[PDB]
Amino acid sequence: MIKQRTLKNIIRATGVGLHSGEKVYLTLKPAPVDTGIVFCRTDLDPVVEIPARAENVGETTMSTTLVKGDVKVDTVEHLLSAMAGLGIDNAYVELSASEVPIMDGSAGPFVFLIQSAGLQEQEAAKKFIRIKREVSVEEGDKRAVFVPFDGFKVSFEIDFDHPVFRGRTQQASVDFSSTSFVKEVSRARTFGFMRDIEYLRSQNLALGGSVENAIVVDENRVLNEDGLRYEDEFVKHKILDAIGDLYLLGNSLIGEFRGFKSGHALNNQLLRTLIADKDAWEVVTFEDARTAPISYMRP
Ligand SMILES: CS[C@@H](Cn1nnc2cc(C#Cc3ccc(CN4CCOCC4)cc3)ccc21)N(O)CO
Numbered sequence: 001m002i003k004q005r006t007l008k009n010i011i012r013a014t015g016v017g018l019h020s021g022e023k024v025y026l027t028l029k030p031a032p033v034d035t036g037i038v039f040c041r042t043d044l045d046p047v048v049e050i051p052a053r054a055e056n057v058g059e060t061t062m063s064t065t066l067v068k069g070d071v072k073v074d075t076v077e078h079l080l081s082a083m084a085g086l087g088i089d090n091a092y093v094e095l096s097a098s099e100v101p102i103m104d105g106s107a108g109p110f111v112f113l114i115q116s117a118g119l120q121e122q123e124a125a126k127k128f129i130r131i132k133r134e135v136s137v138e139e140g141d142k143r144a145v146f147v148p149f150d151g152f153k154v155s156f157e158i159d160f161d162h163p164v165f166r167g168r169t170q171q172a173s174v175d176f177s178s179t180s181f182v183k184e185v186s187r188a189r190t191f192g193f194m195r196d197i198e199y200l201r202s203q204n205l206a207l208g209g210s211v212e213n214a215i216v217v218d219e220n221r222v223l224n225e226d227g228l229r230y231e232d233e234f235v236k237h238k239i240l241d242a243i244g245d246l247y248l249l250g251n252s253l254i255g256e257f258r259g260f261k262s263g264h265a266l267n268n269q270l271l272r273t274l275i276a277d278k279d280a281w282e283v284v285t286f287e288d289a290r291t292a293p294i295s296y297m298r299p
């Protein structure tokens with residue numbers, strides 16, 4: 001069977017919240033079968049526990065925020081993308097502050113931390129959610145859609161309001177094999193335009209931003225000394241974001257996501273619309289990994 005996965009070992013990181021500028025201590029702890037990904041704030045008493053689920057999303061401005069009462073965990077999208085990409089089912093994420101650290105602005109550092117700690121296969125079938133029918137949300141010219149697909153595929157188009165490298169649009173389609181995430185998506189950094197960033201900074205937002213954790217685009221050219229990691233790093237980063245939001249379903253998807261200008265807010269609306277449309281999906285397991293539509297890397 002395709003088995004659930006957790007971490008072999010506890011692993012620890014430190015970093016800064018890009019939004020908050022706060023120093024945060026991050027601990028990833030192994031968890032047992034059918035735990036899911038569960039966030040908790042170690043700096044509160046009592047400690048509060050928030051499953052990484054669509055129903056616990058409270059804010060979607062610039063990032064996905066988990067909320068339970070007045071306790072928040074901000075910027076979950078990059079870490080959840082790493083845990084989706086590697087097929088982690090079960091883990092505790094323990095934070096000393098209200099925001100996941102930004103690291104280098106990609107999922108790369110999280111993937112390496114997880115893959116260092118090692119993956120542990122567990123004696124329980126991994127659960128998948130199979131898209132059996134098309135489900136779409138729109139807001140003006142923005143679109144997000146789930147369509148049936150025997151595997152996992154993301155198609156994404158961004159549409160800037162001015163040309164960047166001579167075009168307003170950037171498109172990528174990734175049909176995921178076991179290695180696609182690590183090779184072609186995980187290293188894609190977050191980005192902003194210099195005028196947007198200066199405005200955000202003025203409003204006391206993006207207090208942990210730097211060239212070390214974000215691509216800065218000064219109108220139509222990249223400011224960062226060493227340039228881009230991928231030709232279309234920007235759309236690859238939006239694919240990373242969508243993968244992190246998708247994992248809030250709490251099980252791995254069999255199907256295709258297609259986004260046109262779809263950010264955390266519309267991605268979250270698509271999740272809620274899919275969940276409400278129960279005839280469009282079904283939970284499934286694969287007792288034979290060899291006949292499954294998805295395969296993960298060896299543990
Ligand atoms: C979780 S990130 C999010 C998208 N997002 N939301 N807010 C963001 C802010 C930034 C930033 C920035 C930044 C600020 C200051 C500097 C330094 N200065 C520059 C040059 O001049 C002087 C020195 C550098 C860079 C980048 C991405 C952002 N996201 O991907 C959600 O998914």
Ligand SMILES: [Zn+2]
Nearest residue numbers: 077190237241
């Ligand atoms: Zn992002």
